Each structure stands twice: as C-alpha cells, then as structure tokens.
Symmetry: D2
Subunit: 320 residues, 4 copies
C-alpha cells in the first residue's frame, strides 16, 4: 500500500477536465464539435478548448495536437486556493514528482500543481479558472444529442486494491465495488461529488485511461447520438451499448474518437451525498453487474485503453 | 344541406399541403425554417416550398408573399390521375366554381383542380407531384424539435352540421365529435387516412382557417419547441399548450407565425383504419373534451383564425 | 410461382391477431400479463384472450394450451362480410384446403375462413368481431412499458420470391426489400395498412413464424421492458436489441416467451399510405440494413422460429 | 436581521423529510400511494411513512391524522451525531424554543432536535435513521409516473431579506434570486446539497408551507401524472403547469392533495456544487423568471399555502 501522508489530503470538489493529445486536430475537431456538439470556448492552430452545455468553468476538455495519442492530464478542482498548496505538500510527502505553475498549464486555468501519482497517472489540482457563459438555457443551441456535463474518468491499473486505498486516503468514498468471496476488490467506483463517481478503477495493464464520460438529460439523447453516427456512416465507432449498467444504474453508450480514445455518454445515476451512503457490493460472478440486460461485453472494452503521459510529455510504460 | 351529387366522390387519400400568403417573406422564412426547422425543397424571391422530415412529395407548405395574410388553398392528394377528373365533375355538379390547370397551381404539382367549395373554402385535388429525397433517416439533420409529417387542417365554419354532411358525402368518416343532448354536432374530426383526422370543423365565423398541424415523434420534441421559443424571447407567440387533448388523445401545442396564422404541433393519436372504427362522442359540457388536464382555453383560440381566398386571390367575406 | 386466380383477392384491412399454442398456460400468462402488461379480454382454463391498449376488437392474441408449442393462425381482418366469401373463393381457386365456420374459430370472432396457404401457413380472414372497451385513455392502467397495438407478423419461408409474388397478387404492397445486384429478393416488408408492414418474409427453413410485433408510444417504453426483465432476472430472455432497424427505421427489441416464441416490441416507423409510396431497396451487403448502428445479429435470430399448424392441428413439416 | 450566533452552525447535508398533518388518513393514503405511487415504508392506524424510489433513509414523508391540516416539521439531515448537538446550541443562542428527543420524534429517526425557528417554522435536525431497502433498481415496481427522490421545500414568509440573511448564516448558499433595481431580494433559492435548492423563500403571509417537491427521472414521467389524474377525474387538483421554470430551469408540475397541501413534481435542474457557483439574479419585471414559456401564473399559487405548527402542535398565527 501507498503510505498515508501526515499532511491532510487536499479538499477535492469534483473531476473538472481532461487534456488529451490527438494526432490530427482537424479530424478530432470534426468528431468532438461537428458530431458530438461540444461547445468551443476558444481555440488556436494547436489546441481546442471544449465545454459541455451546463459548464461555467473554462473547459471540460482540451484537445492538443501531438505525435502520440495519449492523455496528458486528469484534472480535479479543489475547494479553495489553499488546497492547491495542500495538494503539492501531500504528493511531495509521498515522494512523487510534482510541478507547480502559478500561471497554469492550460489556458483559462490559474495556479495549479500537476503530479505523477503513485499509480503513474498525471493528476492536476487547481482552483482558479476563468468563468464563461453558462449555456444552460440556450435552447436555441440545444442539439438532439446534447452533452450537458462532464461526469467522470475511468482508469486502468494492475493493482486495484492498492489504488483503492490510495484514493480513499485522498478522501474519495466508494459508492459501489465488485469483490469476490475472498473480499478482494476487482473494480471500484469512487466519488467526491454527489453522484456515483468522479473516477473509477478497472483492473488491467496500466497506467491507462479507459474513458472519460459526459452526461445527457434523457435517454433519447443517447439514442440520437447512435442514430446520427449511423447516418454519418461511422457506426463502426460505436463500441458498446446502448445499455443499462448494473453498477451505477446509468443508461450508457461507449464510442471511440478518431485516435481510438474512448468516450462514454451516460445518464441517470443516483444521489450519494449522505455521510453513510450504503456501498453496493457486486459479486464477480453476477452476470448483471456490468450490463443489467445481460448483453455481451465486447473484448476490446477490456483490452484497449489510452496511454497516459509523464510530466515531460512522454508516455508512461504500461505494466502488463 | 348541400345536395349529394349523382357522380361519385373523388377518392381522397390524405391532406397534403397548404398554400399560405404571408406579408413579409423573410420574416416568415425565419420562423418556419430557422425556428421550426422545416426543410426547404426550393425557393425564389416570392415563394418558399417547405416539407417535413418524412415527406417524399414536393412540399407540405407553400409560403407566398402577398398584401393580405390569408390561406390560398387546402390541398388533398387523390388516388390516381382519374380522380382529378372525378373531383372536377363532382364540384361542377354542385354548381361550384372550378379551375383546372394541367400544369398545376404550385411548383412540383401536376394536373390539379381548385374549387371554391360549398362552405367557401379554396380546396385543391391533385395526384401528380415531383418526388424528392425522403429525409427519414437523415439523423445528421434531425433537430431536437423535429416536425416529421403534415397531419391535418382545421376549418372554422358557421354551420357545422351542414359542413359535416357535406364532407361525409365526400367520403370522410367521423372518428370523434362533440354533440349536445339534442344530437346536434358542435364540432367534428374527419378522416380519409388512418389517423384521427385530415380535417376538422369548428363552429364560428367563417370561412376561416383555424390551423394546420404537424406531428413530432415524441412528446419531448414538442417541449423543446417551447424551450427554444423562450430562449429566443418569442414565447408570446405560444398561444395554447402544451397539453393533452381529450378529443383525439394527442399531446399538443399551438403557436402563432408572424402574420398570426396558427400552427399546431401534435403527437400520438391512434389508429382509425378499420371499417367500423367506433365514433367517440363527447358531450358539450364535458370539461375534459378539449384539454384532458382541465387547463383553461385561451379566448383568442376561439375567436382568431385566418382569412381564406377565393379563386381570384381575394378574401372570402366572413359570415358572422 | 403460385398462379394468379381469376377471382378478385379479398380486400384486406390489416393483421388483427395471432393464435398461439403454449405448453403451460400459467407460465405463459405470467409472461404476457404480469411481465408485458397485455390486457385480458377474457379467459378460461384452457385459453386466454389478450389485447393491446388501443385495440377495440376482441383480441390481438389468443393463448391456447396444447402439447406442442406452435402458431395455429395468422388472422387478418377484411373490409366487409362479403370479403370473407371472396377469401374462400380465392383460395379454393388456388387449390388450397379451406375451412369456413359461420360461428368463428376463436371466441369473439364471427364468420371466418381459415386456409393452409400456398406457403404452408394457416391464414384466417374475418370481418365480424365483438367490440370491447377501447383503453386508449385509461391512463390509470397505463404501465411504464405499455404495448399499444399489434403491428405485424414476420414469416420464415424457403423461397422468398415465390412468397412475395403471391402476397402482391393478394394486394399487399412492398414498402422495403433487400435485393442482390442480380435483382433477387432476399426479404420483403409488405403492407395493406398505412405503416411499413402487416407481414414480412425472411428466407430460411419454413414455414415457420419468426415473430409477432407490438408497438409502444415512445422509445423509453421499450427500454423499461428491458429494465423490468433485468429486475425479474429474466434478462436471458432478451434475444436481440434494443436497437434501430435500417429497414423500417423502427426502434426495436426482440424477446422470447416461455416456449421460445419470439415477440418484437417496436416503435416509430413511417407513413406508406400514398399510392406511389417509394419502395426502398437495400443491398444484401449493406451492413446497416438490419441494425442501423452496425450491431452484430444473433445467430439464433436467423435459425430459431416457431412451428405452424395445419388445419387439423398438426405441425407443418419444415422444409430445410 | 436575526443576530449571527457565536457558535458554529450545524453542518447540514440536505432536506430529508416533511411531517404533514392530514384530516382523513384514508383519503390521503389514496392520493399519495394509489395515485402518486410513493412507497410505504410502514404504517399504522394514525400514521403513514412514505419514501421515494431511490431513498435509503426511513422516509421522506410522514402523514399523520389530525384535526387541522398543517405541516408539523421540515426535517434536515446533518453530517454526524455531533451536529445534532451543534444545532441545539445554535438555536438556544438565538433564543429559540428547542426540544430534543434522544429517541426521535417520528419512527425510524434517532436523536433529534426540533426548533421553532426565527421565522416561525418548525425545523428538525437529525443524523441517525434506520436504513431500508433502496428501490433504485426495482424496475418491477417502477410506475409510469415514478417519483424518485425528495428535492426541496418552499416556504412563505413576510420578510424575505431577513429570512435569507438568516439561512446564509446557517450555511445555505443562494444559487438564484429575484431582485429589483434597488437590490432588494423578493425571493431566493438556497442550497446545501449540489442541486439548485434544499429550500426556497417566497414573499407572502406566513409562516406557511408553500410546497414540498419530488423529482422524476424524465419529462414524460411528469406528463403521465397529469394524464392519470385526468383519467381519474381529478384534473381539478392540477393547479399549475406543466411548464418550464425560468429560475432553476426545471420542468415542473404543481398539484394539490386532499387537504389542499401543494406538491411539486420536478425534473432536471443543474449542478451547483462548486465553491464559486455563480448566483443567477433575475429582475422582478422579467416575465420569463417564473415560467420560461410566458404562461400566466394562477392567483391561488401566490395566495394559498399550508399552516405550520409550533412545538406544542398548535398552528402558528399567520402574519398578513
Ligand atoms: O458496465 C460496466 O462495465 C460497469 C460500469 C458502470 C458505470 C460506468 O460509468 C462504467 O464506465 C462501467
Ligand atoms: O383541444 C381541443 O380544442 C380539441 C382538439 C382535438 C384535436 C385537435 O387537433 C385540435 O386541433 C383540437
Ligand atoms: O433488423 C432487421 O433484422 C430487419 C427488420 C426490420 C423491421 C422489422 O420489423 C423486423 O422484424 C426486422
Ligand atoms: O416558476 C416559479 O414560480 C419559480 C420557481 C422555480 C423553481 C421552483 O422549485 C419553484 O418551486 C418555483
Ligand atoms: Mn464510466
Ligand atoms: Mn388540430
Ligand atoms: Mn418485425
Ligand atoms: Mn419548487
């Protein structure tokens, strides 16, 4: 197990954005903006800043042109400027490499610290961000498959029990998990905000990014995304779903972007804000734990996932 | 009563399109295309031809620039070219003014006959029409408030029993009506196709066009139209609804175009195709006959309606 | 090809009901009434009469206890009493075995003729039926997965071109078909009523019943059926879907009853009522013709189908 | 203004339940259970404990038989057992009457303190409660108009600025408010949990309970409630809506129980959890602040509200 530091954990409010490296920016823009309908906060020749309909912070996604498709950062917003200091101190005590930039690492974000965490993932903690027009009631812009908010990340790592105790120490609570009779954790859903999760851990070769997920208001919005992809003849990019998750109870869809990064569209989970919210444990042999409808899980869903970068911009080696 | 001709009635398949005269074409285009999302089949400086998502005939609506906002024609498609002849013969026997144009009255329509019917309405019967791309599966074009097909017309006339017997002679059947204890008809819903109606008769000063109605696939599409109008700050053009009709059982919305013409958006009525489909009779005092939820009916809904034109292009005088 | 008779074909209005033989009536009742929510018109120790929410004829399904699960009759309603005579005369001229019963074959149905048609299927034609309370507006009964009407049948037969030419002589029109470069029909969707089909032909070992289909009002009603089956732990009975069909454009779901008979839940196809409604032809190699989202079909969907009975109640041998 | 205590405010997690006094328990049960579909946790001859689908604490509503219809308690769950002590200390310092019961005031709740707060409202704070089966995935129980969770309370008070400053000292944040050019608050929406509100203040004769609100998953669930009430002939109990709120952005419906207590059914507001979540201020003359579609409000909605009880069970006099 990762040691529990003597300094307090930073107070994390929620997952906020992900910075992903793509190989052809124009091709990626077409998928994220023209197909999925995300809103462009701002952009230049090498970077695109996107946000969902109900977001007020500067962006939920940063697309950056690069030679190797990978995830550069999983960013979490902390409760106040002092928590950025707490985050840096906490990881330094763990012996992790850290880098602080008062001016931020991405446009629209202020003082931030990035770290190569104990599991090899590039994590960012920040508090300051530029506010932009919240498009919540801009129904003149509302598309039939509208993505309304960023919900969670999903990470692949070889040792799930080690990762779980580490995120618990950081203050995340386990709303649901999958265990065997021995009591060993195979996967866990973890949260700071009042939904089922901000991040999840899946067992496998890693560190790797399994997916980032956005929510819609209703189920028909998810169906429309599939319909539109069939009309555009890119239905081969629909990987799994739509279906109903056993774990989380969310109606879901997983699609692939042009570099193969996995995007989940999700809707309707439940409230986990209470202090003694009951953890739901599923047995590893329960056939409805993944797909409530018993649908077959595609093999690629367990084996393909995105590389993540270290703080110098190079891929972290995958432990097999 | 209007005499029953000795020649057979033309075989009418369904309501097909309406030609409306608007006072400012650019302002009307903005409402029908930019706000409601109808598809432009073709257009020129004085006329716009629009169609709904699942239509394959040339248009469901013709917008024509004119000095007086009014309805120029209610058009019905007949079963074969010979029914156009039958339509002309039938109205001639009734002594109505008729005009036949082998080349059609509107672009994309072939051989047609227009008549000033016994109630003063300009009716058109045609069979030939140019086919265009049916957009049924063009989900890349599907908007959140998509109108998928033209459903029916609604006409205001002073003597409903006279109008009902006249349309029955034409072969329309009454799926639902409103009567008093005396057995007198106050309103009637009439159809040729297998839905609740192609046209309806409402008692009042006329001849006048009460509304033309389009259908959506689901209820949330109707809600989105309201939401979008609120975002565009034109919610004062929402006249009545959304609500549930007692008569027809349809979920509905009535909005007003820039000249005040009333448009209904409707969804989910039931099948009436069987030969002995039961007529549903509602009593005039049943409070759920109009709005199933008991909502208040706006006074303007009973008093405002559009003028209709005679065959020379002049308004038919309204009998009060 | 089946010869074309010299007498006119009976005027068929729509598919009306199917008589199914089940092996354990209590187990079947639980699935059709308690799980699917169909409404019991009446029942006895050996037979159950069910109807959908918006139906006014006596029943859409008849469940009958028997030794071998099979389909005893595909019933179509004809336009008037005289069409029952025309149906008998038409099949006698084709040399088919026919049996007429003035008092009907199932309760609530009057004068009917049943025939072993040229492809081996037991077809029934009737006009008279007892009317029952139409539950259209009984929202106090409306369930979250409500089936509102019977839509179509799907039949498996070894020679599709023969069956297609036969049904067209009967007056059915082809709304969509699947053909190869050579022009050979592999499958066809055929209709009398104004929807995509009343019956369809699938190539395979037959004669066999592939499925009977019911419609819901909206897409979320179909999703609820799946959710409820997962809660009841019978998700292993969901065979294919939910998905979007390329042919027909309908949102769909296929599930299996206790004896393995296949039921489709379907919603939202389009209007085919015009006399020149364009047939849509799909190529055999178009991967979006079955499932618009490119989902894998299930081998069982092409190989498993129900036996049908001859007029003496014995199963028709299946040609392989 | 109410003085700000020197002891810290209790850490409040969310509104949790309301205790309502009804005049005929059988008539009320019929409305809450048979019509609305709430789930009975337990009941006796004089009291009914109800909860929503996704709730795990003992109840969200308590119905209690009594001589005068009124609200006996607005209950909030606090973060830990120690916060019950902090709540008692905070209100004692304000000079409010308080009553603590180690064994709870209603079944299933533990150590609780009730207070007659500065505005005259009976507030309860508790931590301990019995957990019951969370019905989240019991789709075999899911109704077409299912209420999934308790969302908020709305209170009527004569001095909104006083009440607002008081609740902010308690730690509630203002997600949206209505102000005039002068900066005076006419109404405010306040929250502890990550939705738009836990409670709201409406100006008027009070103290009175304006309404308690429950959420559904989707917009069609709210429409079904209306449809079912029309089928049961109790549409006269639908008071306002359905509509879209400007403030909060939620799709809504207000109905009346047998004693006239107002219930809101609500769905789809947005996330307010960030520490600098922007307050949205609406001007008093903006006609889309209440109903986004410009619908007329109902005078009864501003004038009628429920009496609330003091700690001895007698109604608090209403200041006019
Ligand atoms: O279906 C599964 O594989 C489990 C599950 C539940 C919720 C999620 O967001 C997710 O990504 C995966
Ligand atoms: O609500 C009403 O006034 C009756 C009604 C029913 C169906 C319709 O299309 C319509 O336009 C009016
Ligand atoms: O998806 C397919 O396999 C083709 C298809 C289309 C419409 C139907 O009703 C059906 O039963 C099958
Ligand atoms: O429409 C209004 O009157 C304002 C409003 C907004 C959100 C709510 O929950 C509410 O109860 C009232
Ligand atoms: Mn996920
Ligand atoms: Mn209408
Ligand atoms: Mn089918
Ligand atoms: Mn409210």
């Amino acid at each position: 197990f990762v040691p529990t530091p003597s300094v307090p954990a930073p107070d994390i409010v929620r997952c906020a954005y992900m910075e992903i490296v793509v190989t052809d920016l124009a091709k990626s823009r077409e998928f994220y903006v023209d197909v999925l309908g995300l809103h462009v906060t701002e952009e230049d020749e090498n970077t695109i800043y996107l946000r969902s309909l109900e977001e007020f912070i500067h962006h939920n996604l940063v697309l950056r042109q690069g030679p190797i498709a990978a995830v550069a950062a999983f960013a979490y917003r902390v409760k106040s400027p002092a928590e950025v200091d707490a985050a840096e101190a906490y990881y330094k005590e763990l012996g992790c490499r850290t880098e602080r930039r008062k001016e931020g690492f991405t446009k629209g974000i202020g003082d931030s610290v990035r770290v190569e965490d104990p599991l090899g993932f590039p994590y960012e903690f920040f508090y300051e961000t530029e506010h932009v027009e919240r498009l919540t009631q801009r129904y003149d812009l509302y598309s039939a498959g509208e993505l309304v908010r960023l919900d969670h990340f999903n990470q692949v790592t070889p040792d799930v029990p080690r990762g779980r105790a580490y995120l618990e120490d950081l203050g995340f609570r386990v709303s649901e998990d999958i265990k065997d009779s021995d009591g060993v954790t195979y996967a866990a859903w973890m949260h700071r905000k009042q939904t089922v999760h901000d991040t999840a851990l899946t067992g496998g070769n890693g560190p790797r990014m399994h997916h980032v997920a956005f929510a819609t208001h209703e189920k028909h919005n998810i169906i429309q995304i599939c319909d539109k992809m069939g009309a555009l003849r890119i239905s081969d990019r629909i990987e799994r779903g739509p279906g109903r998750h056993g774990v989380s109870n969310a109606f879901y869809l997983y699609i692939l972007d042009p570099d193969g990064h996995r995007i989940e569209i999700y809707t309707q989970d439940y409230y986990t804000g209470d202090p003694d919210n009951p953890t739901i444990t599923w047995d590893v042999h329960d056939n409805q734990r993944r797909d409530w409808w018993g649908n077959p899980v595609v093999p690629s869903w367990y084996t393909e996932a995105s590389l993540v970068l270290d703080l110098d911009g190079n891929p972290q080696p995958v432990i097999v």
